[PDB]
Amino acid sequence: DMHDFFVGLM
């Protein structure tokens, strides 16, 4: 999901 893009920010 596009929201997963945040997990990659971590």
Describe this entry's structure for a reader:
- Belongs to the tachykinin family.
- It is found in: Secreted.
- The chain has about 10 residues and is mostly loops.
- The radius of gyration is 5 Å and the shape is elongated.
- The termini are far apart.
- The relative contact order is 0.33.
Provide a quick synopsis of the model.
The protein is low in regular secondary structure.
State the main characteristics.
monomer, 10 residues, little secondary structure, Tachykinin-3
What is the element layout, followed by pairings?
Elements: no helix or strand
% residues in beta strands: under 5%
Give the end-to-end Cα distance, rounded to a whole number of Å.
16 Å
Rg, please?
5 Å
Biggest sheet details:
none
Structural class: little secondary structure
Count of helix runs? 0
Shape: elongated
Strands, count? 0
What is the percent of helical residues? under 10%
Protein name: Tachykinin-3
Subcellular location: Secreted
Function: Tachykinins are active peptides which excite neurons, evoke behavioral responses, are potent vasodilators and secretagogues, and contract (directly or indirectly) many smooth muscles. Is a critical central regulator of gonadal function.
Modified residues (Methionine amide): 10
